[PDB]
């Protein structure tokens, strides 16, 4: 044999070793060809949906989602006892490669071992190809190890005007890159070292941004309490007062909450929503080169005010979906909606205004006038939390290679990397297909929980009530399932 | 200032080192005298209640309860992540001894410092005194360090006939031991070593004793099935079937559940209980030399059957009480009743029989008579879980010196020992009182989780509740209260 | 250093102040403790107080102890960046009162989510000082910039009242930032050239409430105006549409503008009345950590130093009662307090 079967996790000090071994089956895509693809074939009825690009015969491996590397238990173990984590090393092995050739005479096909076939598999470490991993697409290794999966088909999109290309478009030939070729006695391994990244914050702040103050003392600062003495003409006056625990709205604070871009508000009780088709017109959306595009998920913002759980920001959520969910027009309870509310202390709510500002200058003939600030970007002195990472969410994304950026952490959450884990492309050699094994390993560094807090934490736990099936487990028919999206913010720190 | 204040606990590897320091005050008991106490002074109206003993001027420290050494957050870290723990080393300090004199002038009183006065402290490492730390008495160091506590008065009992003494009765003068004397500049300490004890299991089995079998495969043993061929006369037969997963009750097994000594069953819904008074008549006890003894808590057994919460064994489980609960005849709501639900896998149910046996020989004319087994001692091949320790429970007891015992582990939980932490006795050297500081330290060896379980566990978790005041914290008046009993068994192992 | 709360941790809240406004609601606790960088605490004194009839008697207690620890791990909540009274006084011969320590936590209304935290300061190891004991530690400062544009418009108010509007616009006219639905006045705000954006100090002896302009010192940040925007003026103008043969050009005012690549700005000017350092809230990200009230923002600011009188009970009873002891000798302590800060120029 060309490799062994390793799946497990080792817990050593601050380190976690995540070992997954999966079994893949790769067919031949595009009948061994490259193909133009565009909107007009599929019908291209939108200027926002207009695209041009090429689908290539190759497949690729994608482990970029968490449920690959962490069993639901080891996720629970990690979340409850840690204040942060991040990847250190990467180790990937390809082995036990097989190539089956297909012969179908009339009704029934016969599949037999072809021993001399080769498999072409290379890794692009210079990021010369288009890199599609940071887009949260399907095709990643199945959460549950016994399941066998179909390796995705690679493809890419280059620049376009409508469906038509432009002279600055590009065409990348995956045959142009030197690629080791593997037979049933060959095995391909490489390793990778993660670049410096900040520990993911996996805690909920105990205190909010505006309650940082001491409740027992006054401030020495003063504020303007009264602009008139009473009812009548000529009451203009200036009165002042100490900012104190009596009125805490006004106390001078060092820090202020982060950015906001307002999302429309949708209720999960369908009769509180307006009787109109506001799904597309209503939603926030950013425009690029004349193409409109939705704002999704957007800046990291609390999902709803405290105490209001039937509301979710229209486009501003990560909405996963339950096992078995249909592709199109599925009912609202077929999907799972994540909520970021744990950040609501530091970050504004997505469906509310960040604040107000004063429009005019008051006089005897003018009232002080204010207006709603809908979208407020970074100002010096802001603090915020990023979006959480979930068992079902992405791990990393590639930071676009550009003049500059601010807070490179990706807006769907996870660890942004300029040199993320490289893409691994594979194909059959030019009716035949391959099957083989994959063992990927990551080494994670942990941040241990330091708290002196007296009273016990919120922990993640499996609820205690009899049910037909154990959660995070197979049903009777064999289909694995993930009942709900498990974020990591449970323990607590001071602000 | 001969010593400092040490409180926080650190977690290192497979060890826990916790420290608590408490502020104490010692009065003057029995007017500096020994006084023989019998029941006839209190009236002793029953023979079970008769006693003979000596109330002594001495005080003593008792740290035997858990929440002394663990904060409710550090009890969580222990129970969520660990299969076992047990004490290894002890360290005890008594320092900053400050003796005051109380001056009484008319009705008002002033109190002053008395410098020459000494306090005496002696600890018994030869175990020549009667050892009273094992009855889970009141007067232990408070759970919340910011409280200040009053040392309990020492005392002991010995033989009696009725309320009168006997020729073998004893008298102990603790004055006859050597002790140390301390002025305002002297501190006292000594170190201890726990004797080798088994890890206290803090997990719930992921299997039940009767289900250990493989669901997929027949046994090769046969069991008696049909003894009749049908209805009629002289129809006797012997038929035999395979033990198989369709019928799992009749299969043969290697091991059988723990012993039982039955209890009466009491319901939390008062209308279901009988109108009679079964508190003493109903209770199961054990008679020693004409004196009955309530069986409390009793042998380790499950509290109730599946899907039957509202019931609890009358004397089968430990019962604490909520803060502010009065001493006598408090309401049911006031007390907190612990339950053994976790051990129902290997242990019989307290309110239920152990099983049945046959009482005769069958023959042509004699039907099979079976009858219930109310109490069952140890048989070879029994397996049983000991009782679970609680945040509020006793840690150790002293195994009564005897020719023989079986499984010395005590009935109220914790670790049995032949040389526990030795008693620590203290007094005012003969209107005088004395204060000071006590910092006790214990070290706990841990047993880490090796489990491969795929799905998440069950954790002790604070609910996401929003209430008037935070749990395990002080309320407005400054009262610190514990809202629930917290058992140690959450994580699971295979059986 | 008086004895606070009679040796008790006490929950406090909005309704325990009487409350009645939602934007003002709060929940938290109060503690019996009071609260290069070198520090020493020496020559401690314990002054016990008896009252015979109505005459008070201050008595030397030599035997008693006093407690202190420092929090270098920042495990406790941190109130020192909020501009609270109770610092070492301006006048070097003044004798001051050690202020009380207590910390706010999460709430909804006056109740507490399960996420609220409760810290018991008795649960750190602490060094207990008698009259002959001294306590000393040093602190090293982390690398910080030598102290020496976006706008969020403030409403404009005049010190000549006949210029001001004849209506009550104190609260209704102010720029605020709502957080979890609680309106929060924007103070002092971003550094700009200011109804709620200006630091204001009181003159010596000034009252607590409804004082008039003459009683307080209203600072102004005109010095930094060369590279900063006017607080009362809109940042600029923009186009609101497309001109055509049929459409005149149109414009609109910019009331607030976030950062843009290539902005330069000055931070807020600091005074001998004002703060030194602040603690950066531990977070995923922040921008320009410099605290909006001025000074040096830090990840590990100087530690907190917590201190209290070690409780000595009164005479306990003669038979054991499990209740804690609620009767204590009246007491308070004082001593010498010396802070030494080395500075760079």
């Amino acid at each position, epitope marked *: 044999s060309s490799g062994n079967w390793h799946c497990d996790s080792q817990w050593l000090g601050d380190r976690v070793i995540t070992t997954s071994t999966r079994t893949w089956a790769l067919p031949t895509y595009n009948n061994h060809l490259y193909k133009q693809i565009s909107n007009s074939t599929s019908g291209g009825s939108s200027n926002d949906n207009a695209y041009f690009g090429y689908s290539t015969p190759w497949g690729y491996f994608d482990f970029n989602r968490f449920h690959c590397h962490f069993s639901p238990r080891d996720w629970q173990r990690l979340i409850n006892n840690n204040w942060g984590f991040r990847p250190k090393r990467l180790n990937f092995k390809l082995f036990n490669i097989q190539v089956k050739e297909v012969t179908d005479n009339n009704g029934v096909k016969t599949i037999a071992n072809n021993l001399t076939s080769t498999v072409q598999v290379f890794t692009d470490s210079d990021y010369q190809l288009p890199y599609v991993l940071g887009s949260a697409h399907e095709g990643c290794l199945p959460p549950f190890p016994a399941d066998v999966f179909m390796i995705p088909q690679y493809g890419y999109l280059t620049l376009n005007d409508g469906s038509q290309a432009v002279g600055r478009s590009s065409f990348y030939c995956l045959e142009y890159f030197p690629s080791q070729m593997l037979r049933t006695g060959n095995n391909f391994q490489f390793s990778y070292e993660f670049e410096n990244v900040p520990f993911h914050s996996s805690y909920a702040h105990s205190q909010s941004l505006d309650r940082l103050m001491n409740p027992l003392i006054d401030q020495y600062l003063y504020y303007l309490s009264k602009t008139i003495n009473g009812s009548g003409q000529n009451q203009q006056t200036l009165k002042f007062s100490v900012a104190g625990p009596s009125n805490m709205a006004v106390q001078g604070r060092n820090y202020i909450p982060g950015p906001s871009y307002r999302q429309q508000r949708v209720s999960t009780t369908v009769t509180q929503n307006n009787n109109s088709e506001f799904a597309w017109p209503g939603a926030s959306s950013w425009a690029l080169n004349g193409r409109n595009s939705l704002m999704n998920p957007g800046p990291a913002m609390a999902s709803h005010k405290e105490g209001e759980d039937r509301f979710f920001p229209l486009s501003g959520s990560l909405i996963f979906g339950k096992q078995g969910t249909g592709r199109d027009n599925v009912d609202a309870d077929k999907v799972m909606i994540t909520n970021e509310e744990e950040i609501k202390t530091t970050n504004p709510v997505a469906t509310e205004s960040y604040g107000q500002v004063a429009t005019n200058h008051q006089s005897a003939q003018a009232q002080a006038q204010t207006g709603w600030v809908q979208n407020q970007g970074i100002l010096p002195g802001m603090v915020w939390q990023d979006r959480d990472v979930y068992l079902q969410g992405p791990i990393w994304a590639k930071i676009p290679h550009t003049d500059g950026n601010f807070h490179p952490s990706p807006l769907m959450g996870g660890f942004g990397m300029k040199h993320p884990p490289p893409q691994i492309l594979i194909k059959n050699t030019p009716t035949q297909y391959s099957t083989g094994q994959v063992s990927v390993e990551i080494e994670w560094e942990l941040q241990k929980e330091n708290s002196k807090r007296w009273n016990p934490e919120i922990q993640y736990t499996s609820n205690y009530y009899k049910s037909n099936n154990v959660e995070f487990a197979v049903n009777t028919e064999g289909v694995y399932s993930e009942p709900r999206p498990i974020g990591t913010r449970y323990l607590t720190r001071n602000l | 200032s001969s010593g400092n204040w040490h409180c926080d606990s650190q977690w290192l590897g497979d060890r826990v080192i916790t420290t608590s320091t408490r502020t104490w005050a010692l009065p003057t008991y029995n007017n500096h005298l020994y006084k023989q106490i019998s029941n006839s002074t209190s009236g002793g109206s029953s023979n079970d209640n008769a006693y003979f003993g000596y109330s002594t001027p001495w005080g003593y420290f008792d740290f035997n309860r858990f929440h002394c050494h663990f904060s409710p957050r550090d009890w969580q870290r222990l129970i969520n992540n660990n299969w076992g723990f047990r004490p290894k080393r002890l360290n005890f300090k008594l320092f900053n001894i400050q003796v005051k004199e109380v001056t009484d002038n008319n009705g008002v009183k002033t109190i002053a410092n008395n410098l020459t006065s000494t306090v005496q402290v002696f600890t018994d490492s030869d175990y020549q005194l009667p050892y009273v730390l094992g009855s889970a008495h009141e007067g232990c160091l408070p759970p919340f360090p910011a409280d200040v506590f009053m040392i309990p008065q020492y005392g002991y009992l010995t033989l009696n006939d009725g309320s009168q003494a006997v020729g073998r009765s004893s008298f102990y003068c603790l004055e006859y031991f050597p002790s140390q004397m301390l002025r305002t500049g002297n501190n006292f300490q000594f170190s201890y070593e726990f004797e080798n004890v088994p890890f206290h299991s803090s997990y719930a089995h992921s299997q039940s004793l009767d289900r250990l079998m493989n669901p997929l495969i027949d046994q090769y043993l046969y069991y008696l099935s049909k003894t009749i061929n049908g209805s009629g006369q002289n129809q006797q037969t012997l038929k035999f079937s395979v033990a198989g997963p369709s019928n799992m009750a009749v299969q043969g097994r290697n091991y059988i559940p723990g012993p039982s000594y039955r209890q009466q069953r009491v319901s939390t819904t008062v209308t279901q209980n009988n109108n009679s008074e079964f508190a003493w008549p109903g209770a199961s006890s054990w008679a020693l030399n004409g004196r009955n003894s309530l069986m409390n808590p009793g042998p380790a057994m499950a509290s109730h059957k599946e899907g039957e919460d509202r019931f609890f064994p009358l004397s089968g489980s430990l019962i604490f009480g909520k803060q502010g609960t009065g001493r006598d005849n408090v309401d049911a709501d006031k007390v907190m009743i612990t339950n053994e639900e976790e051990i129902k896998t290997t242990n019989p149910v307290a309110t239920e029989s152990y099983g049945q046996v046959a009482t005769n020989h069958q023959s042509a004319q004699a039907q099979a008579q079976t009858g219930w087994v109310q109490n069952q001692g140890i048989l070879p091949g029994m397996v049983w879980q000991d009782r679970d320790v609680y945040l509020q429970g006793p840690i150790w007891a002293k195994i009564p010196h005897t020719d023989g015992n079986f499984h010395p582990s005590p009935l109220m939980g914790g670790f049995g020992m032949k040389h526990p932490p030795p008693q620590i006795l203290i007094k005012n050297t003969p209107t005088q009182y004395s204060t000071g500081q006590v910092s006790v330290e214990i070290e706990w060896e841990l047993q880490k989780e090796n489990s491969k379980r795929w799905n998440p566990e069950i954790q002790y978790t604070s609910n996401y509740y929003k*209430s008037n005041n935070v749990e395990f914290a002080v309320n407005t008046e400054g009262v610190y209260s514990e809202p629930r009993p917290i058992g140690t068994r959450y994580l699971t192992r295979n059986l | 250093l008086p004895t606070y709360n009679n040796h008790l941790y006490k929950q406090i809240s909005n309704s325990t102040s009487g409350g009645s406004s939602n934007d003002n609601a709060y929940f938290g606790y109060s503690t019996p403790w009071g609260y290069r960088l070198n520090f020493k605490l020496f020559n401690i004194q314990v002054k016990e107080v008896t009252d015979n009839n109505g005459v008070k008697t201050i008595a030397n207690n030599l035997t008693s102890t006093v407690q202190v620890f420092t929090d270098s791990d920042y495990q406790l909540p941190y109130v020192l960046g909020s501009a609270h009274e109770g610092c070492l006084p301006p006048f070097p011969a003044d004798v001051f009162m050690i202020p009380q320590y207590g910390y706010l936590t999460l709430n909804d209304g006056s109740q507490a989510v399960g996420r609220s935290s409760f810290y018991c300061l008795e649960y750190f190891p602490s060094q207990m000082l008698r009259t002959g004991n001294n306590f000393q530690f040093s602190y090293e400062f982390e690398n910080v910039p030598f102290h020496s544009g976006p706008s969020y418009r403030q409403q404009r108010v005049s010190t000549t009242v006949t210029q001001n509007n004849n209506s009550e616009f104190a609260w209704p006219g102010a720029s605020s930032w709502a957080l979890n639905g609680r309106n929060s006045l924007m103070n002092p705000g971003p550094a700009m050239a200011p109804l709620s954006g200006s630091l204001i100090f009181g003159k010596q002896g000034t009252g607590r409430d409804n004082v008039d302009a003459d009683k307080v010192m209203i600072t102004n940040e005109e010095e930094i105006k060369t590279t900063n925007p006017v607080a009362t003026e809109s940042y600029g103008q923009v186009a609101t549409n497309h001109q055509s043969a049929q459409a005149q050009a149109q414009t609109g005012w910019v009331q607030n503008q976030g950062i843009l690549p290539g902005m330069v700005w000055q931070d807020r000017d600091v005074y001998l009345q004002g703060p030194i350092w602040a603690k950066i809230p531990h977070t995923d990200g922040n921008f320009h950590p410099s605290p909006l009230m001025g000074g040096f923002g830090m990840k590990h600011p100087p530690p907190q130093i917590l201190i209290k009188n070690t409780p000595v009970p009164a005479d306990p009873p003669t038979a054991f009662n499990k209740d804690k002891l609620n009767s204590f000798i009246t007491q308070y302590s004082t001593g010498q307090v010396s802070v030494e800060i080395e500075w760079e120029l």
Partner: antibody
Amino acid sequence: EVQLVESGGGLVQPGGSLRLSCSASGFHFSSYEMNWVRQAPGKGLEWVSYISSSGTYIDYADSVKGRFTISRDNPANSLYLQMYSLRAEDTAVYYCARRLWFGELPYSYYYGMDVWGQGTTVTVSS
Amino acid sequence: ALTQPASVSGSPGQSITISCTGTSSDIGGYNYVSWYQQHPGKAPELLIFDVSNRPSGVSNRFSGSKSGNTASLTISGLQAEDEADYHCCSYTRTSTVIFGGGTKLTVL
């Protein structure tokens, strides 16, 4: 030890008014919803109204809708149902009940009613 | 509302099943149902929540099922205790709950 006990009221005249109040003891009252359901003497249960923990959502089944209000005081652990313009169509045992909760994070819902009040009889008769 | 029979009877020892039928907004579309036993003059006690989920206090013998556009309670091993009136509850499309007429169970 979870106890929902409502005082409420007895016999009252048609066209009159009534105020029912409930008392939650033993469980955190501020987290849960609360329901008012009624059982007419010979007929099955009917759900009158529900109120959210924060009070943001108060919905009435439309029979009553417009004639009753619902209120809850979280510091006082007390739910209130005040009713006007009573009919004979409203005579029932009214229950104070709460819906299932498991103490988790937001966007988690459970459908069923965990604990029930022992009831109060309301007789609206001319 | 939800339609379920007026009454059901069974002999001790044998499992019987009550059904409650509803519109696609009540049941067919949404998975909300729940089941309650009630005894005369006692507050109802929850048996089954969601479809098949069951609370800790409630006994084994009570299970639940949804065959679509319908919901059913299957009681096993009837006893004398099991005599009670069983109710069907399902939150609707508009998130306002509805019940059904109740069904009495008479153990013969």
